[PDB]
Design a protein around this ligand. Structure first.
Ligand SMILES: Cc1cc2nc3c(=O)[nH]c(=O)nc-3n(C[C@H](O)[C@H](O)[C@H](O)COP(=O)(O)OP(=O)(O)OC[C@H]3O[C@@H](n4cnc5c(N)ncnc54)[C@H](O)[C@@H]3O)c2cc1C
Ligand SMILES: Cc1cc2nc3c(=O)[nH]c(=O)nc-3n(C[C@H](O)[C@H](O)[C@H](O)COP(=O)(O)OP(=O)(O)OC[C@H]3O[C@@H](n4cnc5c(N)ncnc54)[C@H](O)[C@@H]3O)c2cc1C
Ligand SMILES: CN(C)c1ccc2cc3ccc(N(C)C)cc3[nH+]c2c1
Ligand SMILES: CN(C)c1ccc2cc3ccc(N(C)C)cc3[nH+]c2c1
Ligand SMILES: [Zn+2]
Ligand SMILES: [Zn+2]
Ligand SMILES: [Zn+2]
Lengths: 230, 230
């Protein structure tokens, strides 16, 4: 029961609520004896754009650039940019990948979207065929730890934003499940800006507490029914 | 007449199918006498990361960086970076905003997500609170023109990918509707890489043909029911 964790962290400010959730994750998983690695995207100035700079080798078709085709071939040839293969090594070795981020437009901040776009390339994360339950990262776990501006009540079916699970679909299903991850239940820390100091400390403590038993959890059924109901 | 269009375009390759869709849109809207502007994000090397470089001069709190607050104040104090305010001017002047992009992980490519994150800032596109039917860009139209790897069949409710409408929710509702756009029906060009020339030119012509009467269209009811309901 020796475990490796990658935290992909997307916040600009170390003193932020996200930074605290990231740090208690590092603290608690470290205390357990886990191997822990953090990719601090903003601190890394992580490149989010999918461009032809991501391939350094002879292009398969230099007249008409197809990012998917060229990165697939570059992965197989090992001519991807090294910032991509650095992240792939971290994912390959991880048993659990935690994404820590504030919700930006019902999704991840663009710098984290770029990580998904560039790191989870064909050949590495998935193949055609070889996706969803046949994805190449099968046997791994993923978990979204998300913070919001909106309260829990705003993110219910009858709330203004609709149920929180609705916006998880592209991330949990379209991305992580597609690559073969099993998905642990999301951690959603609602509206820390609006919360009291007590409620904030409580949300941080609840995450730390959950982490104590994270390795005993079962994943969600990452299906349309789970996300949207009947 | 007298209508103004902004096309926010996110593809690396001018010869691409996305490129062709953008070009027929320019051609047809120009033919109609519309005012047309294109933001070619990759050609612009558009910055996707939400950072403290987005505010010029002195920060509202140089000790603890809060992107939302700093950009809200910067917008009010006319102290945003020029790449952002250049885009805001285009959006302000536009009656219709078309987004042309390939589907990346059930969402927009990160460079376009960064446009959404950085351009549609608090004070300009929405305020806390000032939003959904009351967002700050009310009166404007928006339209997603999306290309996919997956075939139309794969994007059915019981299909592996689920209904294409499921992944539109964060884009049409959580972003565009929230900023006050009325949302025209999406243009989805399914699986051009797999399609024949016949089908590919048909899809380009469907788009060109649709643009002929775009100004007559009713917007969708951008509701949970439209996206998820039967
Ligand atoms: C472009 C953009 C798009 C957005 N889109 C959405 C959206 O679609 N939906 C939505 O709901 N929201 C949205 N938001 C709002 C955003 O999700 C929230 O502002 C964000 O989740 C807040 O998290 P944070 O870490 O930045 O909070 P912070 O501002 O850092 O934290 C709140 C307070 O917690 C304090 N704190 C930090 N650590 C601790 C600790 N250990 N104990 C106690 N207090 C602590 C901090 O000092 C701070 O005062 C958007 C914001 C932006 C900029
Ligand atoms: C990181 C990443 C994530 C992705 N995630 C998803 C996902 O979640 N879901 C999904 O379904 N797909 C996904 N895809 C696949 C992606 O959406 C498709 O590859 C893309 O939409 C194809 O569009 P294109 O413009 O790039 O096609 P192209 O390869 O440029 O075009 C297809 C063909 O059309 C030809 N063509 C160009 N102009 C014309 C014209 N005028 N008439 C006729 N033919 C023409 C081109 O020469 C080309 O041969 C992903 C891809 C990547 C790289
Ligand atoms: C300080 N607080 C409470 C904030 C600050 C910024 C915010 C930005 C948002 C952007 C989109 C959105 N939706 C699409 C729901 C909700 C947002 N809520 C916010 C709440
Ligand atoms: C999340 N989902 C459904 C995805 C994710 C990535 C994808 C990448 C692709 C690359 C080429 C291709 N073709 C050439 C057909 C089809 C692809 N379909 C994808 C579907
Ligand atoms: Zn799933
Ligand atoms: Zn304001
Ligand atoms: Zn809506």
């Amino acid at each position: 029961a020796g475990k490796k964790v990658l935290i992909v962290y997307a916040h600009q400010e170390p003193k932020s609520f996200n930074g605290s959730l990231k740090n208690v994750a590092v603290d608690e998983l470290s205390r357990q004896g886990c191997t822990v690695t953090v990719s601090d995207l903003y601190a890394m100035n992580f490149e989010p754009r999918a461009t032809d700079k991501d391939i350094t080798g002879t292009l398969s078709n230099p007249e008409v650039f197809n990012y998917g085709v060229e990165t697939h071939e570059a992965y197989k040839q090992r001519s991807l940019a090294s910032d991509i293969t650095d992240e792939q090594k971290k994912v390959r070795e991880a048993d659990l990948v935690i994404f820590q981020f504030p919700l930006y437009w019902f999704s991840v901040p663009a710098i984290l979207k770029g990580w998904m776009d560039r790191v989870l390339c064909q050949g590495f994360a998935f193949d055609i065929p070889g996706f969803y339950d046949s994805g190449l990262l099968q046997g791994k776990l993923a978990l979204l730890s998300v913070t919001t501006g909106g309260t829990a009540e705003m993110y219910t079916k009858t709330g203004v934003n609709g149920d929180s699970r609705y916006f998880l679909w592209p991330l949990q299903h379209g991305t992580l499940h597609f690559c073969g991850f099993k998905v642990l239940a999301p951690q959603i820390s609602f509206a820390p800006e609006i919360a009291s100091e007590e409620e904030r400390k409580g949300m941080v403590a609840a995450w730390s507490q959950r982490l104590q038993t994270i390795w005993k959890e079962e994943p969600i059924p990452c299906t349309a029914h789970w996300h949207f109901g009947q």
